[PDB]
Amino acid sequence: ICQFKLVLLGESEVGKSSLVLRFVKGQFHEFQESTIGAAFLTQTVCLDDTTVKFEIWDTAGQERYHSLAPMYYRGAQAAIVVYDITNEESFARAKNWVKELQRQASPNIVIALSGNKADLANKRAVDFQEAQSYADDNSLLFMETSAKTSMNVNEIFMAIAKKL
Ligand SMILES: Nc1nc2c(ncn2[C@@H]2O[C@H](COP(=O)(O)OP(=O)(O)NP(=O)(O)O)[C@@H](O)[C@H]2O)c(=O)[nH]1
Numbered sequence: 001i002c003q004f005k006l007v008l009l010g011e012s013e014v015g016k017s018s019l020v021l022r023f024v025k026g027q028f029h030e031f032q033e034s035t036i037g038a039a040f041l042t043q044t045v046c047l048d049d050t051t052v053k054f055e056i057w058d059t060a061g062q063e064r065y066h067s068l069a070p071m072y073y074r075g076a077q078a079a080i081v082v083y084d085i086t087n088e089e090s091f092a093r094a095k096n097w098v099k100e101l102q103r104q105a106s107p108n109i110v111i112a113l114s115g116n117k118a119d120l121a122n123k124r125a126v127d128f129q130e131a132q133s134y135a136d137d138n139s140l141l142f143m144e145t146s147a148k149t150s151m152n153v154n155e156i157f158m159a160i161a162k163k164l
């Protein structure tokens with residue numbers, strides 16, 4: 001059995017809490033309250049020859065809580081930086097979170113990038129290939145996800161588990 005600490009970071013309203021609720025509880029709430037104090041959840045997945053347990057910190061994404069984030073990413077072995085594919089500003093914010101992790105988090109941290117709300121592709125503002133290229137150039141594990149439909153939610157956590 002292996003255990004890893006994972007943190008979710010990203011602009012407010014991109015769907016961080018929804019992503020963790022979908023992965024941990026199989027839930028999705030159309031009306032999810034903005035996170036004030038970082039929330040903690042845990043979930044276990046089954047790989048080829050190992051049981052991986054995730055200790056997950058779901059951080060508040062509003063800027064006024066930015067100064068608290070290092071308390072949650074310090075020592076994290078993995079991070080999922082989330083943006084909303086319908087909001088380019090949220091994608092730019094995600095890149096800045098990635099920069100902060102590369103400079104202040106553990107040098108061996110595994111960073112995944114979630115282009116969330118992919119079910120709203122009819123309102124896309126961030127091109128998939130552009131995000132894929134950005135992730136490849138920055139050594140980030142990228143997937144578009146939908147906490148609403150479950151698209152790639154189990155998949156992104158499992159892919160992270162395999163690389164830990
Ligand atoms: N269509 C759609 N809506 C989503 C998706 N993920 C989250 N949402 C919606 O987006 C809103 C905000 O989601 P939430 O999980 O609270 O975002 P957050 O990133 O945790 N916000 P904060 O950082 O303020 O805590 C909610 O109304 C939620 O239902 C998704 O994949 N698709």
Ligand SMILES: [Mg+2]
Nearest residue numbers: 016017034035
């Ligand atoms: Mg939240």
